[PDB]
Amino acid sequence: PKAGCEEITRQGRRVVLKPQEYFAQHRMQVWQMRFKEMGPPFSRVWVALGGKMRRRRIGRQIDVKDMRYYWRPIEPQYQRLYMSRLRIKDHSNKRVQPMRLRATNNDIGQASSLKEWERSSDRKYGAALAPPKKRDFEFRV
Amino acid sequence: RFYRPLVNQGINLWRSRMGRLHKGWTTWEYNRDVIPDPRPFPEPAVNNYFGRSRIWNPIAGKIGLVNRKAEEWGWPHQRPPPTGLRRSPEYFPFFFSRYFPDVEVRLVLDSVLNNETTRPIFHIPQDMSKQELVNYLKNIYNIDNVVRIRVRNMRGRRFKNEVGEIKSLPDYKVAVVELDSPVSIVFKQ
Amino acid sequence: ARDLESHQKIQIAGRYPYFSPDYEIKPWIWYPGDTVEVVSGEGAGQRGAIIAVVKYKNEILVQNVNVQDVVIPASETRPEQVVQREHPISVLRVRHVDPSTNQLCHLEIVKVRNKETGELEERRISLESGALLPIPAPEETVEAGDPLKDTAIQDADEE
Amino acid sequence: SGHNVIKMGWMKIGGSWKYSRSYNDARRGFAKGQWQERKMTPRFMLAPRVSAGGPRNRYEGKASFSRLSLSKLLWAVDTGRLNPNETITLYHLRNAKVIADREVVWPGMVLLAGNVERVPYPLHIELQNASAKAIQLLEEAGGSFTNVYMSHEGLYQELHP
Amino acid sequence: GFTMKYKRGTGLWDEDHVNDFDANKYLSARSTMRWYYGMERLQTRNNMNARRATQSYNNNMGLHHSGRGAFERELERRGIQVDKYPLTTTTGAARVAEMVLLRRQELEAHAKKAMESQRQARRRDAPSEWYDETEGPLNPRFLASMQSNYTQVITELPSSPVTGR
RNA sequence: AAUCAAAGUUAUUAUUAAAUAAUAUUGAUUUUGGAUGAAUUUAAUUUUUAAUUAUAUUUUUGAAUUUUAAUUUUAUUAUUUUGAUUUAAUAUUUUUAAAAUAUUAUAUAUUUUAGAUUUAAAUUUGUUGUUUUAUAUUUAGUUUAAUGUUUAUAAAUUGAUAAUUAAUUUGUUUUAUUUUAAAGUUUUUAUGAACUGUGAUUUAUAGUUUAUUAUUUUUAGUUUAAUGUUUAAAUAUUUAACUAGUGAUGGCACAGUUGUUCUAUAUGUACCUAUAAAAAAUAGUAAAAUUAUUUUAAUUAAAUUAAUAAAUAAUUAUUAAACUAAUUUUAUAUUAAUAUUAUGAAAAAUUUAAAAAUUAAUUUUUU
RNA sequence: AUUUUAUUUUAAUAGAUGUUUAAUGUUAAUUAAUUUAUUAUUUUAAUAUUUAAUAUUUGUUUAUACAAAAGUAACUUUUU
RNA sequence: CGUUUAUUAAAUGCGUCGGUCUAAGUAUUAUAUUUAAGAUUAUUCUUGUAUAUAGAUUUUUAUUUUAAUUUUAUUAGUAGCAUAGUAAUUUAUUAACUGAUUAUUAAAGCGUUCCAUAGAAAAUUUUAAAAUUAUAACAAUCUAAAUAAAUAAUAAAUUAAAAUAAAAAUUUUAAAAAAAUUAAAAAAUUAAAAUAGGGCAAGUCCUACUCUCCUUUACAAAGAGAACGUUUAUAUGUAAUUGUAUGUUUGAUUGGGGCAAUACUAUAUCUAUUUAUAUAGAAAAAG
């Protein structure tokens, strides 16, 4: 009667709650292996390794075949690019810090430290990163 | 969880080139499961028309049988009469008919008024054949001289009531009987 | 066929609002002749007697109140007249005045064990005075009956 | 109340969109599932894969323990949250709100002598993997430290007995 | 899915741990009767719903409507108590809370009479030195409520701050 | 000749919409069969009208993801008996329909004439108002959380074991959002052989040249031309041509990655890109838009690279910073942190180039 | 020649060096003058204009066959 | 002699011919094609598909398919014949980019060629009513007004004219400097037009084959005392419908240096272990 007066009387599809994503999606693994982020608070270098360290060695300079061995920082122009996908976790909240590259030990439990998980004995206190579970010697599938 | 899949962008965008014919639609979003209705939307089964070409719906409806039973025999409560009795002229609606007919042979007076007539016209229900109209006038109105009956079928009168719904009367069957010795009616003013 | 224009769609509701079921009020309280006066609308404080009641629409002819000049239509036989009649007036704006107390009373039903008879007939009673007002009994018409096409009772009840 | 268009201050609503050529393009959002670096060989791809799982990866069974600085534990024992008599197993630390749920994961914990040059009273602890200095600090003041290293099945039955 | 079903009845009142986003700022006279009657309904609407399911599913499994198989019928015929912890039944709670109310009521009348021992041990037929108002004017409404505890009039305050007499 | 600026009120009528609510449900809108049934049949180990509390793992390196929550326990598919409740929305029709200023040879409304003129938006990649949109009135017309008060605690490290004298915050756990309009497409199944193909289908209602049953040909519906050009027509009027069909406008028959084709990529219901249906495909990579006056700190840049521009510098921006000799008792925008779909600089001064401008150049670049 | 003309100041204003809405507007605790100030130069959708003193329209005079599809705005009483 | 969506040396059609087929149809037959009937003839030679083949590929040319680049013999040849051209000659016309003839090395026609040829399209000659130039030459029917009341288009106009310079552009503006209403005709301008015509960009489409790749139904192997259907392995077919086929300056270039005012468009020149990052494999200590 008002929105369309005939489009809203005959009925089409009704939309519902839209499922979310893996909310540690942007710590993708081409950094969880390439880099590692070191540093005290408010200065986090994403130190990376040398560029030429596996391809062509014979004949390259003697004292530059080793500049490939140091944990150099990546220049901040890329620090801010990669760490941009991590900030988006709660934007406009000027006091939440960015997601970290690796999962710090206290936040993993922060998921199961929630008033709703207190009743899941399994998966609490670390069960994934726990050692593999041990079962009855008769356990079988 | 079912994690949001990112269908529109990313690889799932290009994967169509990478040998993937059917790019599925997001059947997790509309997931409120209540059926839409097709754009060639069907109109309801009610015969909207009220012209002279109004047609009888041949298709048998379920309810019409159920509404038949509940009056033939108390349907949900009284068990049925055995199929032998139902195939018999002693079944009540065949017994209420063979002994208590229900007919409306109304006479039109505009042809039998002060003007003498040999062909008085009737109206008989659509399902009174000729030789029954004979039997009727013979055994109920003592009319004993009917050599020829002449039968039409007329779409019942239609009109719009002051409200506005087309209130079409039931249909009938003009049957111009032809008596031998003419009949008449007097009207003193 | 199709449906009407909207305010003429509900004009069909507006003109004939008594066609919806239960438009007739909860068990009837107002009958012909009873003490009544209009409190709302027109002429507050006009005590009258109820001439006639049409029920299906909750309407009453309150005498001496809302007397609407009647345009009586007549043939060539008799000359028409213009006499006013009290127009069918609503009841939602009329109450009862106690036939004894003569003050605006709320008349509502009760069930009373009758005396010498056990009908327990639903009897109207005021909510203040307990004025036991019975339901008036209607009348069988004196001059009713078709002379030539009636099977006599003694002739029609022959078992 | 305004459009924080990039490269041009914060514009008003109803303002001029002559200069929002890239605000209409930073509102769609970052490309999803697409390399951030359009040219120039992404800095991630240039660097070499190291340690096939990663430089700090945690596999199933890694000994990564959350650090309980000894100063914390020593601060509590005087404050009065912890009773110095009862061998202070991790139940006491958890139930006395010294450490919460969000810091006790499977390798239970680790005692770290952080700036604690001295421990004054005989202190007994049943924790997991104290640091060598933290051990030689408790052991000097007549205390003990019997490092319990319980399986995960033991980590539960110690916190919710 | 998982929706904290172990919290439905485990609240302290009836309106708790039931997510009802449909609220309003001012719920009117009959919208409040509609509300209170509502919380209990979907608290008893839920229960007898969940009881008819368990009692019917148990009856279809051939065993007593409360799950009691052939064993726990045979033991009760023997008198051997078959349930380890017999939680207190409806007779219990409706009695374990029947005396507590019978106790308070006999303590009120025990204490209603008690305070009169001390109230009549308050000779002050004139107001104490709280009747000062050098700090700020007294409250005329309250005095009319404190007039009972005296004999001299209290409410009559001059245009000036009270002197004290 | 000629102007002259200006009428805001119908009048009169009453129980829908939308979400919500966790009780019913063999397919809503006449009366099967009406011989006696054979004709009223939808069923199978797959994300299904079944809709699932984590950030760690592990993984074609890059769109892939977390395991009972209390075992029938309540997250569960829903209305009459408060116009059924609530909050948001609000009308739709009937008939209404109005008004008394500026010259006297001519640029544009102010009374006192003269002064006065981008209509705007975009686009200006300063090929600098670059040939784009707008008749007017009213209605409808676009989603990034500007905030952290007492229970209460966080903070790193190796490739790996481990090591953690290594030094240090914050947080009763903050997540969700991400423009608007717009394709051709593309895939998923339903409809269509009344138009038109082809299959099949009619065995002699006018004229005529020739010896001839073959054959010239009367030929008023059709290879041309005029008119018509939103036309009387989303193909008609007039007309040229052609016309001999025992082998064909036609029983019913073939249907969409496919039918049919005397084959033109032609047609299969008035654009074959079939219709119909179901999607949010992509469209920032010069499309069109993106709604709130009276404000209160400035500027440009021009380099590494590009199976040629979402990425980098440099600039600009948001937020924040500390006073290192140089001078006057002058004068000084220097930075950090993040946000950033950009490759080309008037007039000069010169420099490449047939340039016939482009290119380098570097100071401009109006509220 | 000189003089003399288009930008070298003041005064009032009025915070300051130009782009993030002002709201107890019936005290969303309303009750007889709230005088609501807030209204998107385009988009569709509905109206109204311009083209339009118009383009079309204009009814003066008379050379007979019967089916079926197709319709059913459809009147009825007429002698199948 | 039929038959067609831009209507014809389109595609049909008879014959001949090539190939296939004797357990579904008659091997002077019917499938499957290429041509075209009629009349003359139908040339030289093979590198690949096909056939045959012998574990297969690789090899391999009775007939067929496609080919012949100097096949080019017959035959016609400036021809719908890649330019060269109006071919050079002859006619024909007052004037021959016409057309026809002769021959004849035609950019690379060519044996399915060539001839014969009827109503068609040309070229002459010639005659002739369409109002063909000359040429202009209303008899006919198609009012106004009165009535009904649509359409494209519409930012505005009081300026629009007109002349001149411009600066990026066709000029339109700006500027300077100039000076006439309503009605109907005309189409010079405004957008008198629609919509075609370009070329570039990103996107998608559709068709094609020695080199890319699946769902693929064929070929071969194996397994079942092989009673036939399936499953494999090895193979990968344009029968296969996926995606690529660029970018920059215009057709070449892609690197890191240097000289050319410590400018460099590619400007102009040159040089050379100036080095090819990652990921799987390869090297297991530091290499």
CSV table of C-alpha atoms (C1' of nucleotides) in Angstrom, one decimal, chain F residues 1-2 61 105-109 117-119 127-131 134-136 183-187 198 216 223-224 230 242 244 248 257-258 262-267 271-272 281-282 285-286 303 305-309 344 347 350-353 355 359-362, chain H residues 2-8 10-13 119-120 151-152 154-159 167-175 177-182 191 201-207 241 244-248 250 254-256 261 263-265 267-268 278-280:
chain,number,residue,atom,x,y,z
F,1,A,C1',6.4,50.0,-31.4
F,2,A,C1',5.2,48.6,-26.8
F,61,U,C1',51.3,-20.4,-0.2
F,105,A,C1',11.4,55.2,-31.1
F,106,U,C1',13.2,48.7,-28.2
F,107,A,C1',19.4,45.9,-24.1
F,108,U,C1',17.4,42.4,-18.9
F,109,A,C1',12.3,43.5,-12.3
F,117,U,C1',25.1,40.3,-15.8
F,118,U,C1',28.6,32.7,-16.8
F,119,U,C1',21.6,29.9,-15.4
F,127,U,C1',42.6,20.5,-25.9
F,128,U,C1',41.6,25.8,-18.8
F,129,G,C1',32.0,27.5,-19.5
F,130,U,C1',35.8,22.2,-24.2
F,131,U,C1',29.2,21.2,-26.8
F,134,A,C1',17.8,20.0,-16.7
F,135,U,C1',10.4,22.1,-19.4
F,136,A,C1',7.9,22.8,-14.8
F,183,A,C1',24.6,-3.3,-19.0
F,184,G,C1',25.5,-6.6,-22.8
F,185,U,C1',26.3,-11.1,-20.6
F,186,U,C1',26.4,-15.8,-17.7
F,187,U,C1',24.4,-20.3,-15.6
F,198,U,C1',10.5,-28.7,-42.5
F,216,U,C1',2.6,-19.3,-74.9
F,223,U,C1',11.2,-9.3,-57.0
F,224,U,C1',9.9,-2.5,-59.1
F,230,U,C1',4.9,8.2,-34.7
F,242,C,C1',5.9,-12.4,-62.0
F,244,A,C1',0.3,-22.8,-65.0
F,248,A,C1',1.5,-28.4,-51.2
F,257,U,C1',24.3,-26.6,-27.4
F,258,U,C1',18.7,-27.1,-29.9
F,262,C,C1',16.3,-25.8,-51.8
F,263,U,C1',22.5,-22.6,-46.6
F,264,A,C1',20.9,-16.2,-45.8
F,265,U,C1',24.6,-17.4,-39.3
F,266,A,C1',18.2,-17.4,-41.8
F,267,U,C1',13.6,-18.1,-38.9
F,271,C,C1',14.1,-7.2,-33.0
F,272,C,C1',16.6,-15.1,-32.1
F,281,A,C1',27.8,-11.2,-11.8
F,282,U,C1',30.9,-7.4,-13.2
F,285,U,C1',39.6,1.9,-13.4
F,286,A,C1',37.9,9.2,-17.7
F,303,A,C1',61.1,9.6,-8.5
F,305,U,C1',57.9,0.0,-11.5
F,306,A,C1',54.0,-1.6,-14.7
F,307,A,C1',52.4,-8.8,-20.7
F,308,U,C1',50.2,-0.1,-18.4
F,309,A,C1',48.1,1.2,-13.8
F,344,G,C1',53.1,15.1,-16.9
F,347,A,C1',53.5,33.6,-19.5
F,350,U,C1',66.1,28.0,-22.9
F,351,U,C1',66.5,22.6,-24.7
F,352,U,C1',65.6,18.4,-27.8
F,353,A,C1',62.4,17.3,-32.5
F,355,A,C1',57.4,19.1,-35.7
F,359,U,C1',58.9,17.0,-25.0
F,360,A,C1',62.0,18.2,-21.3
F,361,A,C1',62.3,22.1,-18.1
F,362,U,C1',60.4,25.6,-13.1
H,2,G,C1',12.3,-24.3,-59.2
H,3,U,C1',14.1,-21.4,-54.7
H,4,U,C1',15.7,-18.0,-50.9
H,5,U,C1',15.9,-12.1,-45.0
H,6,A,C1',19.4,-7.3,-47.6
H,7,U,C1',17.7,-12.0,-54.0
H,8,U,C1',21.8,-13.4,-57.2
H,10,A,C1',23.1,-17.7,-53.6
H,11,A,C1',21.6,-22.8,-52.7
H,12,U,C1',18.1,-26.8,-55.4
H,13,G,C1',17.5,-30.3,-59.2
H,119,G,C1',12.6,-13.7,-71.8
H,120,A,C1',18.4,-10.3,-67.7
H,151,U,C1',3.2,15.0,-30.8
H,152,A,C1',8.6,15.1,-31.2
H,154,U,C1',11.5,22.7,-24.0
H,155,A,C1',17.7,25.7,-18.6
H,156,A,C1',16.8,30.7,-20.0
H,157,A,C1',15.8,34.9,-22.2
H,158,U,C1',13.5,41.1,-24.5
H,159,U,C1',17.2,41.0,-27.2
H,167,A,C1',41.5,31.8,-28.0
H,168,A,C1',41.5,26.7,-26.7
H,169,A,C1',37.6,24.5,-31.8
H,170,U,C1',33.9,24.2,-36.3
H,171,U,C1',32.2,28.9,-34.4
H,172,U,C1',29.8,30.4,-30.0
H,173,U,C1',31.0,33.1,-26.7
H,174,A,C1',33.7,37.5,-24.4
H,175,A,C1',34.6,42.4,-26.1
H,177,A,C1',31.1,48.6,-32.6
H,178,A,C1',26.7,48.7,-34.7
H,179,A,C1',20.2,49.1,-34.8
H,180,A,C1',13.3,46.5,-35.3
H,181,U,C1',6.4,44.6,-34.2
H,182,U,C1',1.9,40.2,-34.9
H,191,A,C1',19.9,19.6,-32.3
H,201,A,C1',39.4,2.0,-23.7
H,202,A,C1',37.8,-1.5,-20.3
H,203,G,C1',33.7,-5.9,-20.5
H,204,U,C1',31.3,-9.7,-22.7
H,205,C,C1',30.1,-12.2,-26.9
H,206,C,C1',30.7,-15.7,-31.3
H,207,U,C1',33.6,-18.6,-35.2
H,241,U,C1',31.0,-25.3,-26.0
H,244,U,C1',44.9,-16.9,-23.6
H,245,A,C1',46.0,-14.3,-28.6
H,246,U,C1',49.9,-7.4,-24.7
H,247,G,C1',52.4,-3.5,-23.5
H,248,U,C1',54.9,0.6,-25.1
H,250,U,C1',52.8,3.3,-34.6
H,254,U,C1',61.4,-4.5,-22.8
H,255,G,C1',68.3,-5.2,-19.7
H,256,G,C1',72.1,-2.2,-16.5
H,261,A,C1',73.8,21.8,-19.3
H,263,A,C1',67.4,17.6,-17.4
H,264,C,C1',65.9,12.8,-20.8
H,265,U,C1',60.4,11.7,-24.3
H,267,U,C1',66.2,12.1,-27.6
H,268,A,C1',71.1,10.9,-29.7
H,278,A,C1',59.4,-16.6,-4.3
H,279,U,C1',56.9,-21.1,-4.2
H,280,A,C1',57.4,-27.5,-5.4
